[PDB]
Design an enzyme around this catalytic site. Structure first.
Site, PDB file in Angstrom:
ATOM      1  N   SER A 245       0.832  -1.217   0.000  1.00 48.97           N
ATOM      2  CA  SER A 245       0.000   0.000   0.000  1.00 48.97           C
ATOM      3  C   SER A 245       0.861   1.260   0.000  1.00 48.97           C
ATOM      4  O   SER A 245       1.942   1.364   0.583  1.00 48.97           O
ATOM      5  CB  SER A 245      -1.049  -0.011   1.083  1.00 48.97           C
ATOM      6  OG  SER A 245      -1.347   1.320   1.530  1.00 48.97           O
ATOM      7  N   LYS A 246       0.324   2.222  -0.735  1.00 43.78           N
ATOM      8  CA  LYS A 246       0.934   3.563  -0.940  1.00 43.78           C
ATOM      9  C   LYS A 246       1.346   4.010   0.456  1.00 43.78           C
ATOM     10  O   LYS A 246       2.515   4.315   0.738  1.00 43.78           O
ATOM     11  CB  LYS A 246      -0.084   4.470  -1.592  1.00 43.78           C
ATOM     12  CG  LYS A 246       0.477   5.528  -2.521  1.00 43.78           C
ATOM     13  CD  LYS A 246      -0.207   6.881  -2.239  1.00 43.78           C
ATOM     14  CE  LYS A 246       0.092   7.365  -0.818  1.00 43.78           C
ATOM     15  NZ  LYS A 246       0.307   8.827  -0.702  1.00 43.78           N
ATOM     16  N   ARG A 247       0.354   4.001   1.335  1.00 40.92           N
ATOM     17  CA  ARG A 247       0.621   4.338   2.758  1.00 40.92           C
ATOM     18  C   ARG A 247       1.159   2.982   3.258  1.00 40.92           C
ATOM     19  O   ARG A 247       0.346   2.032   3.206  1.00 40.92           O
ATOM     20  CB  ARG A 247      -0.612   4.742   3.545  1.00 40.92           C
ATOM     21  CG  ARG A 247      -0.888   6.233   3.763  1.00 40.92           C
ATOM     22  CD  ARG A 247       0.185   6.848   4.610  1.00 40.92           C
ATOM     23  NE  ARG A 247       0.334   8.270   4.435  1.00 40.92           N
ATOM     24  CZ  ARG A 247       0.438   8.986   3.311  1.00 40.92           C
ATOM     25  NH1 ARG A 247       0.418   8.454   2.080  1.00 40.92           N
ATOM     26  NH2 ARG A 247       0.555  10.329   3.425  1.00 40.92           N
ATOM     27  N   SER A 249       4.583   1.648   2.206  1.00 42.08           N
ATOM     28  CA  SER A 249       5.350   1.186   1.048  1.00 42.08           C
ATOM     29  C   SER A 249       5.298   2.232  -0.059  1.00 42.08           C
ATOM     30  O   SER A 249       4.168   2.712  -0.221  1.00 42.08           O
ATOM     31  CB  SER A 249       4.867  -0.151   0.505  1.00 42.08           C
ATOM     32  OG  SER A 249       5.676  -0.778  -0.469  1.00 42.08           O
TER      33      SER A 249
END
Length: 468
Positions: A245-247, A249
């Protein structure tokens, strides 16, 4: 004629996820003489982001995964953009109807919403509308969808090249929409026509599709066209796992390219995402990978995408693969970008070589080796503190340096050893302050290499600034 594809959606940032599905698609092809196609899945106009397409294609080219058919260039197999292929979907949706494998269903979304709350989902009730009736309604232009007319009383068997065969009761498989009222294919319609038309022969995709294969398989059959081979990829996570996940990683490839990650190292690392080299090697991308390449050594455990590992790998590329002239060339863009410059190509190479040991990303170069390119570098608080405890000593030392001609490490070392020796002080009490005064750091590479390098007048001029 192995033919593989990637079908990303221009709904954002080049995903690491796409680099990943793409590499096994690129590998399998090349490893077979085959072709690697690129189709843009740009129908979810809600989701669409303008330059997103552009940045996707660029990035794959960035990792050096070139394709023989894609948007920017068309090719044999006509459209490479779903939203431009629109008509080709009504027509199969139609052909599929003219053969009783599909059907129209006129329930309002509100209506659909109630069957659901009562039957767990769509009971396929519109299947009891006389065909020709259903057509009248269509003519009148009554909003409907085109669903799949799954042979309800039968069985379905799907094979995944990595997970094996699975048997399905057709009850488990639902009458899925193929065409929406606005007439836009669902993934199921599109994937099959496109794959078919574009001649893909092996489907290497996100594990997420595994479940829907029975449907894809029915469709191949509904059109009575050969099913390709299905390869469902293990999927990416975080350390302390979790679908990436963007948030939690960084998942943007552009981020990688900007932080000074080398294409080759990122690439060499996506390879290690489930896939072990016979010979236990974790270094050499492409060419050597796309030959070791065998479904045999691909893992199904949802590989962990650890960034610390990537930077370890990136640092290895900097020091044990790339040559000093290659690195020294790749660091240039970041120097510029940091408002730096070098007085000769020689210096640049002597700075990169002394620093090599200390940076794992091209971007960390201008940050760590700042003092080597500008007279205006930062002084840590500890350096300063130190420059004060040793101030009297540099005061005494300046005249000796001012006299020094042969500005060699050799000379320089002997001189400093002299002065410590002459002052009833260990070299260190001369060494730290000097270091502090030179590089603003207090933690640095060879102190004599650092004194030599800049040359006399950089040293001297920086020596006064601190005293004077």
């Amino acid at each position: 004629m192995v033919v593989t594809r990637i079908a990303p959606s221009p709904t954002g940032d080049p995903h690491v996820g796409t680099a990943y599905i793409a590499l096994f698609n690129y590998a399998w092809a090349r490893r077979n003489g085959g072709r690697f196609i690129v189709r843009i899945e740009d129908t979810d106009r809600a989701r669409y982001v303008p330059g997103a397409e552009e940045r996707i294609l660029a990035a794959l080219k960035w990792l050096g995964l070139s394709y023989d058919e894609g948007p920017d260039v068309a090719a044999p197999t006509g459209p490479y953009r779903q939203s431009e292929r629109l008509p080709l979907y009504q027509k199969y949706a139609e052909e599929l109807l003219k053969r009783g494998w599909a059907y129209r269903a006129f329930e309002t979304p509100e209506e659909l919403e109630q069957i659901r709350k009562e039957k767990g989902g769509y009971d396929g009730r519109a299947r009891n509308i006389p065909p020709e009736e259903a057509e009248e309604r269509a003519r009148r232009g009554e909003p409907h969808v085109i669903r799949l007319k799954v042979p309800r009383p039968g069985t379905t068997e799907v094979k995944d090249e990595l997970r094996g065969v699975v048997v399905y009761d057709n009850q488990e498989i639902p009458d899925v929409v193929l065409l929406k009222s606005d007439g836009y294919p669902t993934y199921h319609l599109a994937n099959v026509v496109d794959d078919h038309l574009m001649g893909v022969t092996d489907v290497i995709r996100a594990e997420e599709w595994l479940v829907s294969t029975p449907i894809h398989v029915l469709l191949y059959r509904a059109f009575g066209w050969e099913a390709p081979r299905f390869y469902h990829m293990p999927l990416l996570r975080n350390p302390d796992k979790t679908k990436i996940s963007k948030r939690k990683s960084h998942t943007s490839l552009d981020w990688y390219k900007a932080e000074g990650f080398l294409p080759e190292a990122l690439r060499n690392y996506l390879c290690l995402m489930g896939f072990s080299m016979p010979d236990g090697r974790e270094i050499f991308t492409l060419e050597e990978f796309i030959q070791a390449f065998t479904w045999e050594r691909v893992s199904l455990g949802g590989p962990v995408f650890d960034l610390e590992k990537l930077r370890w790998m990136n640092g290895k590329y900097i020091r044990e693969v790339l040559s000093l002239e290659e690195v020294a060339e790749r660091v240039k863009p970041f120097l510029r970008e940091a408002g730096l410059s070098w007085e000769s190509e020689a210096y640049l190479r002597r700075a990169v070589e002394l620093m090599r040991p200390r940076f794992d990303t091209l971007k960390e170069f201008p940050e760590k080796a700042r003092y080597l390119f500008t007279e205006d570098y930062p002084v840590s608080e500890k350096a300063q503190r130190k420059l004060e405890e040793g101030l009297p000593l540099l005061k005494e030392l300046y005249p000796r340096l001012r006299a020094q001609e042969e500005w060699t490490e050799a000379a320089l070392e002997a001189l400093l050893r002299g002065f410590a020796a002459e002052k009833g002080v260990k070299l260190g009490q001369v060494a730290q302050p000097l270091r502090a005064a030179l590089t603003g750091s207090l933690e640095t590479p060879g102190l004599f290499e650092i004194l030599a390098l800049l040359g006399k007048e950089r040293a001297l001029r920086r020596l006064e600034r601190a005293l004077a």
